[PDB]
Structure 1
Amino acid sequence: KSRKESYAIYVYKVLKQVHPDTGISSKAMSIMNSFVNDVFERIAGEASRLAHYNKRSTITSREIQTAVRLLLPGELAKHAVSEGTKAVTKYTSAK
């Protein structure tokens, strides 16, 4: 289809939560969208390897959590894992 899907709106919403007074150029937004897609591909890519290495058939939070710990550096991983686990905890508990 003609319609192109991009994380623009979501990146913008995060920007508003971080710096509501600050805007973002279309060029900077293109970089951010490509950045999100690259990091997404890395985590999903490593998550697939983890499942295959264990001959598993489904990607779970453990694979994502492990991929994050492998791909992201020390502090980013620890902080990202806290955010990820919190989001999964709230999602399942809120129901």
Structure 2
Amino acid sequence: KTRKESYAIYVYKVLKQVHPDTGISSKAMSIMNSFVNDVFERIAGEASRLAHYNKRSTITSREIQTAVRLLLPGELAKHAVSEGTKAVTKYTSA
């Protein structure tokens, strides 16, 4: 049996962070995994197109931030940008 990887453990960890008592079903896990994959693909494609437009061979945090600003609507983009900036700063510190 081959090993199929999915964002199930991490989604469950986030759910327990948010709702420690509330559980999840299998179809909800499938929808969560599909949503995460779709958003990842959208952001990665936008960042790749941004890098290609400016004639760059490297995807950096700037490309991801600009892709997030372009795709995510309204306050979602601002909040995601703030969270990503905080995570990048924390990783750089450590």
TM-score tier, shorter chain, comes to: over 0.9
TM-score (norm 1): 0.97
Distance in 2 (alpha carbons) for counterparts of 1:77 and 1:92: 22
Whole-Å Cα distance in 2 between the matches of residues 69 and 22 of structure 1? 32
User: Moved runs in structure 1, 4+ residues, more than 2 A?
Assistant: none
3-state SS, counterpart of residue 3 of structure 1: coil
Normalising by structure 2, report the TM-score. 0.98
Moved more, 46-55 or 1-10: 1-10
In structure 2, distance between residues paired with 1:80 and 1:71: 11
Tell me the distance in 1 between the aligned counterparts of 2:55 and 2:69: 20
Output one character per residue of 1:27-73: Cα deviation in whole Å (capped at 9) or x when no partner. 00000000000000000000000000001000000000000000000
Instruction: Note the residue ranges of structure 2 that are not aligned, 5 or more in a row.
Output: none
Report sequence identity in percent. 99
What do the CA deviations read for 1:6-38 (whole angstroms, capped 9, x no partner)? 000000000000000011101000000000000
Computed over aligned residues only, the root mean square deviation of the Cα atoms, in angstroms, reads 0.9
Q: Distance in 2 between matches of 1:49 and 1:74?
A: 22
Q: What's the CA shift for 1:3? A: 0.7
Q: What is the CA distance between 1:74 and its match in structure 2?
A: 1.4
Q: State the 1:2 CA deviation.
A: 1.2
**Number of matched pairs:** 94
- Per the alignment, in what secondary structure is the counterpart of residue 85 of structure 1? helix
Q: Distance in 1 between matches of 2:9 and 2:74?
A: 29
